[PDB]
């Protein structure tokens, strides 16, 4: 007698992890970037760059 085409069934689980990294920024160089008070020359200074 013949044979039948067998097959199997597999169930797998998703194992969860997570990575993280961080940096900072100095309070002295905070307002130097976003601060829109600098009118005419500090907007193209060297320390801003």
């Amino acid at each position: 007698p013949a044979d039948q085409p067998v097959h199997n069934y597999m169930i797998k689980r998703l194992d969860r992890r997570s990575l993280n990294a961080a940096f900072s920024i100095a309070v002295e160089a905070l307002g130097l970037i976003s601060g829109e008070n600098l009118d005419g020359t500090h907007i193209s200074s060297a320390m801003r760059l």
Partner: peptide, 17 residues
Amino acid sequence: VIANTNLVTSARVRADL
């Protein structure tokens, strides 16, 4: 004023005096 290395070569207040 903050310049790079580029180079060239009133009111009436109350007071005592």
